Amino acid sequence: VLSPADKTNVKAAWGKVGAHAGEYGAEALERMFLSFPTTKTYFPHFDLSHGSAQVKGHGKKVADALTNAVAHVDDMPNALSALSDLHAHKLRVDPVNFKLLSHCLLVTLAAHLPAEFTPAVHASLDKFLASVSTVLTSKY
Amino acid sequence: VLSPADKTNVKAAWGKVGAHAGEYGAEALERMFLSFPTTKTYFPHFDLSHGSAQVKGHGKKVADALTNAVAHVDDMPNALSALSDLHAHKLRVDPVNFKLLSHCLLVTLAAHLPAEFTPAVHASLDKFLASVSTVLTSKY
Amino acid sequence: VHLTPEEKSAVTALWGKVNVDEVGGEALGRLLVVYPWTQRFFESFGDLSTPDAVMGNPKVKAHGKKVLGAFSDGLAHLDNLKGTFATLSELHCDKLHVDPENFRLLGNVLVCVLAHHFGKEFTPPVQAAYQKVVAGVANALAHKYH
Amino acid sequence: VHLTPEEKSAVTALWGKVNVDEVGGEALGRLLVVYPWTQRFFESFGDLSTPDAVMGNPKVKAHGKKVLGAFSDGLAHLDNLKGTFATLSELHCDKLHVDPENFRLLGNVLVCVLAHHFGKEFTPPVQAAYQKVVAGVANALAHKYH
Numbered sequence: 290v291l292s293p294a295d296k297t298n299v300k301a302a303w304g305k306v307g308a309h310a311g312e313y314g315a316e317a318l319e320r321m322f323l324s325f326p327t328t329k330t331y332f333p334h335f336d337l338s339h340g341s342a343q344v345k346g347h348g349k350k351v352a353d354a355l356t357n358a359v360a361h362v363d364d365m366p367n368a369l370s371a372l373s374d375l376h377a378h379k380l381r382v383d384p385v386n387f388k389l390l391s392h393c394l395l396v397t398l399a400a401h402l403p404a405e406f407t408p409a410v411h412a413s414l415d416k417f418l419a420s421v422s423t424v425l426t427s428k429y
Numbered sequence: 430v431l432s433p434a435d436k437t438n439v440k441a442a443w444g445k446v447g448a449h450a451g452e453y454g455a456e457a458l459e460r461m462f463l464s465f466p467t468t469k470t471y472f473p474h475f476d477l478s479h480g481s482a483q484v485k486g487h488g489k490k491v492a493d494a495l496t497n498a499v500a501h502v503d504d505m506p507n508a509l510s511a512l513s514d515l516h517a518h519k520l521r522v523d524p525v526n527f528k529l530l531s532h533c534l535l536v537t538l539a540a541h542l543p544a545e546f547t548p549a550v551h552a553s554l555d556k557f558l559a560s561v562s563t564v565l566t567s568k569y
Numbered sequence: 570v571h572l573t574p575e576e577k578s579a580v581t582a583l584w585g586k587v588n589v590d591e592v593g594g595e596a597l598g599r600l601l602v603v604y605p606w607t608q609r610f611f612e613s614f615g616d617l618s619t620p621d622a623v624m625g626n627p628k629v630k631a632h633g634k635k636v637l638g639a640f641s642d643g644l645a646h647l648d649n650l651k652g653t654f655a656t657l658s659e660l661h662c663d664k665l666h667v668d669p670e671n672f673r674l675l676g677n678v679l680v681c682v683l684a685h686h687f688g689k690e691f692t693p694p695v696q697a698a699y700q701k702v703v704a705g706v707a708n709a710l711a712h713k714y715h
Numbered sequence: 716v717h718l719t720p721e722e723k724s725a726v727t728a729l730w731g732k733v734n735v736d737e738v739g740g741e742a743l744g745r746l747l748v749v750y751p752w753t754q755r756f757f758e759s760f761g762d763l764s765t766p767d768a769v770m771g772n773p774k775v776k777a778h779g780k781k782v783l784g785a786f787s788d789g790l791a792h793l794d795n796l797k798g799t800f801a802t803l804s805e806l807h808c809d810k811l812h813v814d815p816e817n818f819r820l821l822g823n824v825l826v827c828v829l830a831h832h833f834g835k836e837f838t839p840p841v842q843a844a845y846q847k848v849v850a851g852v853a854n855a856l857a858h859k860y861h
């Protein structure tokens with residue numbers, strides 16, 4: 290359950306992310322691949338090297354999915370339904386891995402938004418990413 | 430997402446549990462306390478010895494909560510709302526522990542219902558208990 | 570890991586009654602059915618589209634026999650699980666990159682299979698002893714991540 | 716755990732710039748705010764009703780200083796974390812019965828605090844090195860469960 294204060298906090302922090310959203314998604318992916326190398330096996334056809342155009346393009350897709358979730362925070366199962374089908378059915382992503390990407394997204398936000406990443410906003414963003422992760426794993 | 434087949438399977442297996450529900454809840458609790466001793470710290474005022482009347486009485490409460498969840502499987506957040514408030518706010522139960530009790534409930538069902546505990550029903554019961562656990566942890 | 574003599578007794582007496590040709594396939598099949606993302610690692614096994622296809626799959630039964638033999642080897646070396654599972658750890662960690670959370674899952678599925686097979690014989694104290702074993706095996710298999 | 720010389724370099728250079736009187740309290744406070752069930756273990760700390768009360772609590776800052784000192788000790792003994800954290804493992808496991816998943820959580824909160832404090836300096840490779848450290852500390856703290 291995202292509280293009213295949580296939704297306000299998530300809107301504010303992601304709103305300050307602005308047009309960097311694509312770049313931050315790519316950085317979170319690189320953080321995950323380097324910190325948690327098991328996650329790399331899901332992208333054998335990617336070049337995962339730094340500066341990879343495939344990682345940059347994918348990070349924009351990830352950021353756009355989160356932006357969609359923020360914009361439809363009261364209706365996330367519906368908004369992310371096609372994405373949950375993809376991850377669970379076709380890609381068969383291990384649910385553990387959503388915790389890893391969520392952590393790397395928080396680290397990325399912390400490293401870029403020193404003013405916004407207060408303890409209260411940190412708590413709200415963690416609950417938001419946990420809620421997104423719950424939706425994306427709901428379809429095994 | 431519990432599928433239609435999952436709801437049918439859970440109804441059938443729990444329906445066969447019958448009036449043993451109270452006893453099975455108490456056995457699952459004992460299984461958890463012995464297998465995962467960290468869980469005992471939540472019950473310092475309980476006598477956790479075998480045959481304890483407090484564990485027997487509590488196991489009936491647990492079984493009745495699951496029976497309520499089965500009977501309202503399409504509306505579990507509402508049915509379990511007061512229970513989720515209790516576990517998250519007042520008791521502050523570590524979310525890890527719901528996986529431990531869910532596992533011990535499956536073990537208890539497996540040990541008592543050899544005919545019902547097929548792989549398909551095992552999968553449905555695991556998804557059901559994961560759904561109950563998600564509701565009970567939704568309120569931190 | 571350290572089992573008490575009573576814990577060792579409980580584990581050993583039950584394991585001598587296990588059908589070593591079937592219980593491994595039963596636990597592996599249930600892992601693939603209950604935790605479907607694990608099917609990602611078994612694409613070469615063929616039909617896993619339904620629970621009956623999984624449990625009836627001969628490659629699942631065959632491979633489950635090898636998995637159970639590894640658990641049997643762990644039961645015989647309860648205080649050198651790390652050395653026992655060293656080559657298995659390099660396989661699962663360095664080459665397969667299985668997340669170690671799934672080692673815990675398979676161990677818990679094995680416990681469910683033993684409860685199903687032995688019924689009331691699989692008492693809470695007997696379970697508690699088996700949870701120590703499967704936790705120790707999972708930890709040893711994950712040492713190459715540690 | 717084994718860090719490469721480049722990983723050791725990245726970790727050591729950043730840690731020498733950490734304010735050891737504040738970062739521990741910041742990580743502990745955020746743990747209590749973000750993962751509220753951990754407040755179960757700190758009833759004697761007083762007002763934890765709001766995030767500002769947690770972060771401003773003097774007992775939180777004081778205890779966080781001890782936690783950070785333990786991480787510093789781990790950084791100095793990267794290949795004997797088990798011996799380093801032995802008495803701490805008995806405290807958290809045998810006497811407090813903290814679930815070891817929370818050791819991983821606190822480690823990840825520390826990583827978030829370091830990213831917040833150091834910004835772009837906390838590069839993905841620097842993070843990857845710190846994840847190895849906090850994973851090794853968590854594993855050593857949990858050895859009395861293992």
Ligand code: HEM
Binds near residue numbers: 332355
């Ligand atoms: C917050 C969590 C996540 C979000 C919002 C997310 C979002 C997305 C999106 C938007 C796509 C592209 C959909 C399309 O192009 O049709 C995608 C694809 C994909 N995702 Fe995720 N994802 C998340 C977590 C993960 C995790 C944890 C993994 C594995 C470690 C993963 C693995 C993949 C893979 C393998 C693809 C296919 C890439 C390709 O073949 O081009 N995702 N994801």
Ligand code: HEM
Binds near residue numbers: 468515
């Ligand atoms: C499927 C999961 C669970 C269910 C259905 C469940 C259900 C219940 C119910 C029905 C009650 C009594 C409510 C009342 O009397 O007002 C209760 C109380 C309680 N539960 Fe749970 N519970 C679950 C998991 C857990 C876990 C994992 C823990 C901790 C390891 C836990 C700890 C407690 C405690 C400490 C109490 C208070 C007991 C007392 O002081 O009398 N519960 N639970």
Ligand code: HEM
Binds near residue numbers: 661665676
């Ligand atoms: C307690 C946990 C486990 C044990 C004891 C175990 C045991 C084994 C054994 C004995 C082998 C055969 C190695 C050989 O042929 O020399 C094997 C292979 C394999 N295991 Fe496991 N396993 C465990 C968990 C898992 C899990 C959870 C997965 C996937 C989700 C997995 C995936 C595989 C794969 C893909 C192979 C084939 C590797 C190859 O042939 O190259 N294992 N395992």
Ligand code: HEM
Binds near residue numbers: 753817818852856
């Ligand atoms: C990396 C993880 C952790 C480290 C390095 C760490 C470190 C420490 C240290 C150095 C002490 C002081 C011991 C002494 O005074 O001699 C301590 C005490 C304590 N820790 Fe932690 N800790 C960790 C995780 C946790 C977590 C996650 C919790 C609770 C959720 C926790 C609960 C406590 C409590 C209650 C005490 C006080 C025990 C007492 O005074 O008797 N610890 N810890």
Ligand SMILES: [S]
Binds near residue numbers: 334336337
């Ligand atoms: S790759």
Ligand SMILES: [S]
Binds near residue numbers: 351
């Ligand atoms: S992704």
Ligand SMILES: [S]
Binds near residue numbers: 472473474475476477
């Ligand atoms: S107790």
Ligand SMILES: [S]
Binds near residue numbers: 491
């Ligand atoms: S409970």
Ligand SMILES: [S]
Binds near residue numbers: 636
């Ligand atoms: S396996």
Ligand SMILES: [S]
Binds near residue numbers: 782
């Ligand atoms: S602590």
